[PDB]
Design a binder for these strands. Structure first.
Ligand SMILES: Nc1ccc(CNc2ncnc3c2ncn3[C@@H]2O[C@H](CO)[C@@H](O)[C@H]2O)cc1
Ligand SMILES: [K+]
Ligand SMILES: [K+]
Length: 545
DNA sequence: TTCAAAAAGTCCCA
DNA sequence: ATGGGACTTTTTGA
């Protein structure tokens, strides 16, 4: 339950908040970490503070009580008035308390360390500087009892599929003094995710965001599957409302390339650009001026979105895939009438323009009438996981029989010509499905509304959607998940805007040629790339880029 | 009644 | 052992 932040990032965050502190004007700064753990941040704050006081001790001695401000009194003063920490783990607090004590009985100095839940603690005062690494807990791994508390007391940032660290953002902002500075490392996902919409609004309207370090899919925490960003903000009265954005260019770099993080940021491994916080909509589009010009051209030229012209839906959620999904060669399928069987694909089966031939079958068990008529299927296939099946939420509530699919959707949505795409991918892969394929939630589908079929064909749509232009276009606002993986979910895929002009026929014709080649047995992969290049030129010509 | 979001992902191997 | 790559379930709130 305790995660170790890399030292190069801790030093950067502590320096970010304290490097320009005027210790003469305010020799009582309150520095807080509300998830301090063992004190990765607070111990470094101690060292920075100690040098700051020691470097100015005689100036403080002259300006203030000359008996109080001595080098020998620095350690006591830091612990009494300057360093504050909170963590739920008692053992970590005890270790940090010993570590702070061992930085030097005389007078039994008091240390402002609290073992508590920072989201429930009544904070008696606000703080000049707040730093640290909050806990990240998603909607599956959070207790339902605790979530009721969060939904009630943190509703301005926490709803639906929000994360626990959203609330720490709210708590940090709320207990930050006017003119204070906060700097934390959190997941990057709130920058683009649908769940983070309210959190983005709360940050934008309550603090000035100084800097965003976006590591994208880089691995900052060793052996942890998370993507990180560093956010620095203040409550200073400033007319300037511009954010420094540092976005990594190579996700493969090692974080320890230089002695300091700021060396990495200034280097060629990162790009820098500014964003006007006042121009932020509910979406934070953090791109350089070239990409902004590119993105704005496409938005203005395209009169339709996919949502306007298409019906989107998520795939089947069986609730226990091992109970319902069988290899097409499994002998147990001889027990299942073919009326119950559906072709089943995974995200890896989706290529550009076409789906691989399916290798698995789904037992659409919702069409099994009662347990007596098809007892063999229930006893020998589905019943092998009956205990696990009965634990699904809708089985416990009686909504579903123990052998039904949890979310079987509508068969008629899948048994038609449609476009499918993987839910997580390195690139745009939109395919026309000709084979009535079913899939889990790792594959999304849509079909074109009847009233738009004479304006857009499936062949035209996969042509532009798979183009290099739309790959770049979608990734500008897409949710970056891990190294070389973006989310392709309807909440952003359906916002993709599309156009229709004089190039429609040739684009559609090029797409049909690609599909014809791809579906060949003696598939000529080489010519497909040439046709794709020609299509990209038409699309770039159409959009004037 | 029934939709769709959510990586402190998960798992394997060199 | 670790770091890197291939690939992706079902729980959950609304
Ligand atoms: N039951 C339950 C109780 C409390 C909360 C949330 N409130 C917390 N208040 C303070 N510190 C926390 C909290 N949660 C995790 N930490 C620590 O954050 C660090 C980051 O890894 C670690 O050292 C953790 O100990 C949620 C559920
Ligand atoms: K004095
Ligand atoms: K990562």
């Amino acid at each position: 339950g305790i995660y170790y932040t890399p030292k190069i990032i801790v030093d950067y965050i502590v320096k970010k908040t304290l490097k320009n502190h005027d210790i003469i004007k305010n020799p009582y700064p309150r520095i807080l970490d509300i998830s301090c753990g063992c004190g990765n941040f607070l111990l470094e704050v101690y060292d920075i503070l100690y040098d700051l006081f020691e470097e100015n001790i005689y100036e403080l001695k002259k300006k203030y009580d000359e008996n109080y401000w001595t080098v020998d009194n620095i350690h006591r003063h830091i612990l009494n008035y300057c360093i504050y920490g909170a963590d739920i783990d008692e053992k970590a607090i005890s270790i940090l308390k010993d570590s702070l004590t061992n930085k030097k009985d005389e007078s039994d100095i008091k240390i402002n360390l609290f073992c508590c839940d920072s989201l429930k603690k009544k904070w008696r005062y606000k703080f000049d500087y707040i730093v640290g690494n909050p806990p990240y807990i998603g909607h599956k791994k959070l207790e339902k009892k605790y979530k009721k508390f969060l939904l009630e007391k943190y509703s301005e940032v926490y709803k639906d599929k929000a994360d626990l660290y959203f609330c720490f953002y709210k708590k940090i902002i709320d207990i930050l003094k006017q003119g204070g500075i906060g700097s934390v490392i959190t997941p990057r996902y709130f920058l683009e995710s649908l769940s983070g919409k309210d959190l983005r609004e709360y940050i934008k309207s309550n603090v000035n965001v100084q800097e965003i370090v976006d590591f994208l899919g880089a691995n900052i925490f060793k052996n942890i599957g998370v993507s990180s960003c560093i956010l620095t903000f203040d409550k200073k009265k400033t007319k300037e409302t511009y954010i420094d954005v540092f976005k990594i260019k190579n996700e493969d770099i090692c974080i320890n390339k230089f002695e300091t993080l700021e060396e990495l940021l200034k280097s060629s491994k990162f790009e820098h650009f500014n964003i006007n916080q006042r121009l932020l909509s509910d979406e934070w589009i953090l791109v350089n001026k070239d990409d902004e010009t590119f993105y704005n051209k496409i938005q203005e030229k395209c009169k339709y979105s996919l949502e306007d012209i298409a019906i989107s839906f998520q795939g089947i959620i069986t609730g226990c895939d091992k109970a319902f999904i069988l290899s097409k060669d499994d002998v147990k399928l001889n027990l299942v009438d073919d009326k119950f069987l559906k072709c089943w694909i995974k995200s890896k089966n989706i290529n550009k323009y076409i789906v691989d031939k399916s290798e698995y079958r789904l037992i659409y068990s919702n069409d099994i009438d009662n347990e007596n008529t098809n007892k063999r299927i229930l006893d020998e296939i589905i019943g092998l996981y009956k205990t696990k099946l009965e634990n699904r939420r809708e089985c416990k509530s009686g909504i579903r029989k123990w052998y039904e699919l949890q979310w079987g959707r509508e068969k008629l949505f899948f048994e038609r010509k449609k476009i499918m795409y993987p839910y997580k991918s390195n690139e745009n892969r939109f395919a026309i499905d000709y084979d009535n394929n079913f899939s889990s939630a790792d594959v999304y589908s849509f079909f074109i509304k009847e009233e738009y079929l004479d304006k857009f064909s499936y062949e035209y749509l996969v042509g532009i959607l798979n183009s290099s232009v739309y790959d770049k276009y979608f990734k500008i606002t897409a949710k970056k998940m891990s190294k070389n993986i973006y989310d392709y979910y309807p909440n952003k895929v359906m916002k993709i805007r599309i156009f229709r002009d004089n190039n429609y026929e040739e684009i559609e014709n090029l797409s049909k040629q690609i599909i014809s080649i791809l579906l060949n047995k003696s598939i000529d992969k080489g010519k497909v790339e040439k046709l794709q290049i020609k299509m990209d030129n038409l699309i770039m010509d159409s959009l004037g880029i």
